[PDB]
Amino acid sequence: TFPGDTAVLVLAAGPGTRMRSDTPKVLHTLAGRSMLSHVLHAIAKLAPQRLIVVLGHDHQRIAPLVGELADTLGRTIDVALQDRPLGTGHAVLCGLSALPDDYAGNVVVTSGDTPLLDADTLADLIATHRAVSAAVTVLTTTLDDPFGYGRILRTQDHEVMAIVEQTDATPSQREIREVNAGVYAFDIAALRSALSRLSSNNAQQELYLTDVIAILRSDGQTVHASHVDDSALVAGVNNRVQLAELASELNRRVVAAHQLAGVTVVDPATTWIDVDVTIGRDTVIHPGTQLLGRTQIGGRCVVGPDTTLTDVAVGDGASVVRTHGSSSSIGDGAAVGPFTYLRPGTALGADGKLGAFVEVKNSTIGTGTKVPHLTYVGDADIGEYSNIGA
Amino acid sequence: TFPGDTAVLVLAAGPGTRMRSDTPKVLHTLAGRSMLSHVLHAIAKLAPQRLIVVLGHDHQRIAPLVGELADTLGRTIDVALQDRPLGTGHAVLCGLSALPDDYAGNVVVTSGDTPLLDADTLADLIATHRAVSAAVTVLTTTLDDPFGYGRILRTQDHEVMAIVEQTDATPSQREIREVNAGVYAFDIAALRSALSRLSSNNAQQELYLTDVIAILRSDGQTVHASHVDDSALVAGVNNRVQLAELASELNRRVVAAHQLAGVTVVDPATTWIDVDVTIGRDTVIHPGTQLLGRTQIGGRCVVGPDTTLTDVAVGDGASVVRTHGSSSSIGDGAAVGPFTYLRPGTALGADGKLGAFVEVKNSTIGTGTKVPHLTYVGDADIGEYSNIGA
Amino acid sequence: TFPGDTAVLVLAAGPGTRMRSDTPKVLHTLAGRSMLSHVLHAIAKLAPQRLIVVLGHDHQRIAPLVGELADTLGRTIDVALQDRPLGTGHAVLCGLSALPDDYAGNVVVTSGDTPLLDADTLADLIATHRAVSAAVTVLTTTLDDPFGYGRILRTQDHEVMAIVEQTDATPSQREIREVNAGVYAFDIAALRSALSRLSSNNAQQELYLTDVIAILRSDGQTVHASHVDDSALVAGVNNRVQLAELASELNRRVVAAHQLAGVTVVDPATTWIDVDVTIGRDTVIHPGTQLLGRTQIGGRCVVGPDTTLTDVAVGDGASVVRTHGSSSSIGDGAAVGPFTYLRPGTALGADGKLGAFVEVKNSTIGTGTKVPHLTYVGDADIGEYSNIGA
């Protein structure tokens, strides 16, 4: 993890206007966590000296969660407010205003809307930045559609000249496919200086953090650009199309990891698995299944098809078919479905059965108890090896 | 829209033998409309002077719908019958036989089996055709598998020489990937003349409309070929594999448009949305959902997973989960599912609840009324704020 | 089919350690058959003189099924045990130990974990091998990720020099994308000789069957390498990611074949169809449907959405919607669903109805009998044209 005293600025003060939502962009969720939660989790895991989230637009709606996140990650996370919305450059300034004017450690700048950014990418960025002893290193990548992204300008020797933002890009610059990831590692002194030379002149009368690269190029300073070949790692979310695209990509990776760890997943494209979910060896997951929240599946289970489980605990060798359930537990070797509905507080004992058109709410159903079909069981406590219906 | 007096021939008189169906090809449906309906809709929206659908094989089965379509589009749509099946050239002839022998406006020829063809493509074709003052302009494109399509023959100066049909293509011509879209814009005089010189000689002893290009090339006439880079726009349906491929592509576009307009769609690949469907801001759609016919969803709803709604009206902030419903309405803030079945004539009031294993037919269920579970409600009128079961 | 006296060795004696399962790799299932069953089926259909499956790791768990398979394919299938696990070369040796020391016919070597290998690929391999009068012909192909595969080494004249296994490959050899399929056709004498010269020296101290190619190259012998452009045909399964990838690919092909034969499949990506399944003309299959085992669907049916049928027989013009069923039959023009559960032994007569939240077990329900909703019917015999509930 991080060298230290590394200080990380997380930039989350812009309007995600293109989301077309009344909920703030970085709060939109993905695989069981908001984009912001994703970022904060990867960052925390490296343990910077400082960690400073910059708020702005809708800050009163986001702050709580940062605090939630701090206590969850057992770490202190500072919040810096952006006075007015004068751009990303200004935004980084507020961020720094959270550090001692004598702070020396390098500074990593990142955004709140790149949910797939992982540890290795961040560790690589630091190591590269230290290796080439750069002033700024900037993570780039190449996309089939650079739309919306800052473009990377390189002379024939691949030396980086600057970054032009989509708004300020010329029709020929727009053709450039190498994009600015928006993940930086700055030497702090270099950084502060470069910020003091920003011009609101062009082209959204804001202070572009991206302008810092040309400035540092200019003033005889060392400027490195590290290209991330796996783009998903560093892609950003601006609209709900991108959100879904990234969701699917991350799901792909979650499922795949479960498969290599011994879980048969019949149709990955339609099996949705949240990041906290655990699944046991030789379990089989059939199509149209979502496993959400803190759902746990033991080994040798059969789950699905068409099963939705949120925060459900499932024992070994259980059968969970066409079941809609949440906040419940299902015992070893138990059989559930098809067409079964588990409401919060259902606890079904080992080898128990809940058959078709059965609904359970707030009930404990003992070991080996069967509820064959067409029956509701609410707020009940049913002993072991009974039968029930209707 | 169209310049006028533009006359459009829609060619729908061939057997879609490769569909392997007893239903006529152009009648097969896609995203809530038949291929023919799709075409007629895009064409109508430009408002040609004349609009002439050519029937032939199975014409008694298709005509009604053209008439349905005419009255639906508030427009007069003529039908021309093909006497015998002597090819596309002949077919265009019958089409013209619906125009005054003194008709002057340009003539656009199109087919009934290119369901994704949109306004811009057609407007571009006319503008190009007028710009270059062509005799014929023909829409082309490039496919990974040109199979079945007419091939575009170009000399080294990209001048178009002719179009060779798949049947008459040589093994080396078959390698050509640029295909004939089958969308033409003809200067009428040029057209009539070129048709009078068609030879049934080769290679299905028919009169190929495609042969017109070589003829006009030949007789010192101006021949343009406009390439449509977005192939889906101009792809044709010959078999059910192609139908499904295009269905999926159009769905992709429908969902995407909803996403950019503010709707969260968790898994686009498994969310099917018909073209007339409306969806409100910040609504969330979970996987395995179809929204069909004239289904309307308000804002801030939660729909799915595994939900199928056809011609259902849903208010704001409603919850519609694992529900199979048609021709019904669901009030603001109402909760439905999981495992709920709505038969035609269900009208559920605002804040009403229909829980698991509940079926409603032809019933009005008042505001705030709950039907918790395992209950059938038929032909009933239930007042406000009641409870029901079983 | 095969020339004869062709003898085929099927190699299934290695640990599929990367499956991370307690079930032997070649036993993992795909589209209604285990990988091994797939291979044996394609091989049998060519009717070699001899057919010899080599077992080893977990052989007591696999043998039964080979015997099951032999009697199923009405053919004698020999099993050869590998004494110790000394590699693929050794493995082929045991295989040969099942043949007469005077056996003359050519020998095809294949593995148990290439479930998509089809007749044409195998027939081509023999014809090529005989044509070029090769000593060994080896099926190759090119993958985007050669990981795990033997690499093909070719000099500038595309002459094949050898095959280097992933373990023994150098970082530059690892870049080679052309892989060894692991499907061989050997002239027997040449083969036996080449095996007697194998060195356990490198790099997993085993006897690599792949080393045979370099040996035969070396000793002035004719060595051919036939490249299979359709990789899926010849891809192998080492982990559950690959299993799912191949499953999906084979499903793609099964569905597509049904589509071209006249079946509308709305969403192929979510329609799963086992290889024995039959479906009738103009039937429509809606999303989230699996058709498993020996399920038969007549013509003009409507199946799905969200329907799972295993070994179910369905008549013409039936409706089967959101139904979970197995080992049952459903009559012509019958209507089933939504939310219907058919347990083994359900036989529903023509024009019968089983509505929502209905479960049937071990029952015969006569012609035109309705069970509207919310009803269980077990072990019953219900006459024609009755009504039932509840």
From Swiss-Prot, chains A, B, C:
GO terms for biological process: cell morphogenesis; cell wall organization; lipid A biosynthetic process; peptidoglycan biosynthetic process; regulation of cell shape; UDP-N-acetylglucosamine biosynthetic process. Its cofactor is Mg(2+). Phosphorylated at the C-terminal domain by PknB. The phosphorylation is required for acetyltransferase activity, but does not affect uridyltransferase activity. Residues 1-240 are annotated as: Pyrophosphorylase. It is found in: Cytoplasm. Keywords: Acyltransferase, Cell shape, Cell wall biogenesis/degradation, Cytoplasm, Magnesium, Metal-binding, Multifunctional enzyme, Nucleotidyltransferase, Peptidoglycan synthesis, Repeat, Transferase. Pathway: Nucleotide-sugar biosynthesis; UDP-N-acetyl-alpha-D-glucosamine biosynthesis; N-acetyl-alpha-D-glucosamine 1-phosphate from alpha-D-glucosamine 6-phosphate (route II): step 2/2; Nucleotide-sugar biosynthesis; UDP-N-acetyl-alpha-D-glucosamine biosynthesis; UDP-N-acetyl-alpha-D-glucosamine from N-acetyl-alpha-D-glucosamine 1-phosphate: step 1/1; Bacterial outer membrane biogenesis; LPS lipid A biosynthesis. It catalyses: alpha-D-glucosamine 1-phosphate + acetyl-CoA = N-acetyl-alpha-D-glucosamine 1-phosphate + CoA + H(+); N-acetyl-alpha-D-glucosamine 1-phosphate + UTP + H(+) = UDP-N-acetyl-alpha-D-glucosamine + diphosphate. Binds 1 Mg(2+) ion per subunit. GO terms for molecular function: glucosamine-1-phosphate N-acetyltransferase activity; magnesium ion binding; UDP-N-acetylglucosamine diphosphorylase activity. UDP-N-acetyl-alpha-D-glucosamine binds at residues 11-14, 25, 82, 87-88, 111-113, 150, 165, 180, 238, 343, 361, 376, 387. The keyword DNA damage does not apply. Its EC number is 2.7.7.23, 2.3.1.157. Mg(2+) binds at residues 113, 238. The active site is at residue 373. Residues 241-261 are annotated as: Linker. Acetyl-CoA binds at residue 390. GO terms for cellular component: cytoplasm; membrane. Catalyzes the last two sequential reactions in the de novo biosynthetic pathway for UDP-N-acetylglucosamine (UDP-GlcNAc). The C-terminal domain catalyzes the transfer of acetyl group from acetyl coenzyme A to glucosamine-1-phosphate (GlcN-1-P) to produce N-acetylglucosamine-1-phosphate (GlcNAc-1-P), which is converted into UDP-GlcNAc by the transfer of uridine 5-monophosphate (from uridine 5-triphosphate), a reaction catalyzed by the N-terminal domain. Homotrimer. In the N-terminal section; belongs to the N-acetylglucosamine-1-phosphate uridyltransferase family. This is Bifunctional protein GlmU. It comes from Mycobacterium tuberculosis (strain CDC 1551 / Oshkosh). The gene is glmU.
